[PDB]
Amino acid sequence: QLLFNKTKSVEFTFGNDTVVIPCFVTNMEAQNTTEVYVKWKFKGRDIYTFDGALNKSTVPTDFSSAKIEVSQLLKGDASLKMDKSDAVSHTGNYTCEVTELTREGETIIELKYRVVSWST
Amino acid sequence: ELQVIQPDKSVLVAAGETATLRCTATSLIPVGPIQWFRGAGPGRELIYNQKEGHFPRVTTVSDLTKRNNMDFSIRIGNITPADAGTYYCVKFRKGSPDDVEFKSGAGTELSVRAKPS
Ligand SMILES: *[C@@H]1O[C@H](CO)[C@@H](O)[C@H](O)[C@H]1NC(C)=O
Ligand SMILES: *[C@@H]1O[C@H](CO)[C@@H](O)[C@H](O)[C@H]1NC(C)=O
Ligand SMILES: *[C@@H]1O[C@H](CO)[C@@H](O)[C@H](O)[C@H]1NC(C)=O
Ligand SMILES: *[C@@H]1O[C@H](CO)[C@@H](O)[C@H](O)[C@H]1NC(C)=O
């Protein structure tokens, strides 16, 4: 399998304009992005996919801001980036699934909203 | 072209012992996983994949964390008659909302026999 540097959860507040969901493969050994496939699942639904063979990123229109920095894939970084409107409407557990040729693996991260104090 | 080879058509195992289900891929392309199932069709049972899942009785013959690994053989410990059936080593291509079966091995019939005493 592909092995991960696991984070149980990440928190964001009213203050985050954008949010990052970490995903880090520790034994990534890919030479090219054509060898890689990425799936980000939110409550079992695919909300971001990257098909390396077609260099194609796909997101449903309710998750329009969802993206990964494709250049970081060879480093094992498949972290998901989204804007606050998508984060606030999709809090909960995410699964990050990565495939490199025939090796595969996944990890779960909870995106948690934290209510804090603000000055008008 | 890819071949998923199950060299054993059958395996006979004494109850309580370990079954070895052999599988080798001739290639690691197209991108996609190899999984083991019991049975074929709609009601086939997932027996193993590389993800963290619930396959406690399963160990792999080789080190599947290796990029160049082509051996997908598994071992199932403490065999009982309940484990009997035909096992398939199956290759998928990646897809959303579902990965698509690409190639399957020919199957290995696991049969079980009583152990003395
Ligand atoms: C996860 O893994 C790397 C080690 O490979 C570690 O150095 C890094 O701090 C970790 N990532 C994060 C964002 O904590
Ligand atoms: C939200 O913003 C803080 C900094 O203000 C940052 O440390 C944190 O990683 C952000 N949360 C997420 C989930 O991106
Ligand atoms: C990846 O391989 C494709 C051909 O399969 C090639 O077009 C592309 O430029 C390669 N990229 C790198 C960074 O090697
Ligand atoms: C997220 O999943 C973990 C188990 O991996 C569970 O403990 C947690 O309660 C889940 N959170 C939600 C809000 O579903």
Numbering used by the authors:
A (entry chain B): 1 to 120
B (entry chain A): 3 to 119
Quote the study that presented this structure, word for word.
The two most common alleles of SIRPα (v1 and v2) are also the most divergent in sequence with 13 residues differing in the NH2-terminal ligand binding domain (total length 120 residues). The interaction interfaces of SIRPαv1 and SIRPαv2 with CD47 are almost identical with only minor differences in the DE and FG loops. Ser-66 (v2) forms main chain and side chain hydrogen bonds with the pyroglutamic acid lactam ring, whereas in v1 only the main chain hydrogen bond is possible. Although the FG loop of v1 is longer than v2 due to the insertion of an Asp (Asp-100), v1 mediates the same interactions with CD47 as seen in the structures for v2 in complex with CD47. However, the SIRPαv1 main chain oxygen atom of Pro-99 can form water-mediated hydrogen bonds with Asp-46 and Lys-39 of CD47. The variants differ mostly in surface residues on the common Ig-like domain and distal from the binding site, so from a protein structural point of view, the suggestion that these have different affinities is unexpected. However, the values we determined for the affinities of the other SIRPα variants for CD47 are not significantly different from that determined for v1 (Tukey's multiple comparisons test) and are close to previously determined values. The polymorphisms in human SIRPα lead to changes in surface-exposed amino acids, but we show this does not affect binding to CD47, which shows no comparable polymorphisms.
CD47 is a widely distributed membrane protein that interacts with signal-regulatory protein α (SIRPα), an inhibitory receptor on myeloid cells that gives a “don't-eat-me” signal. The amino-terminal ligand binding domain of SIRPα is highly polymorphic in contrast to the single Ig-like domain of CD47.
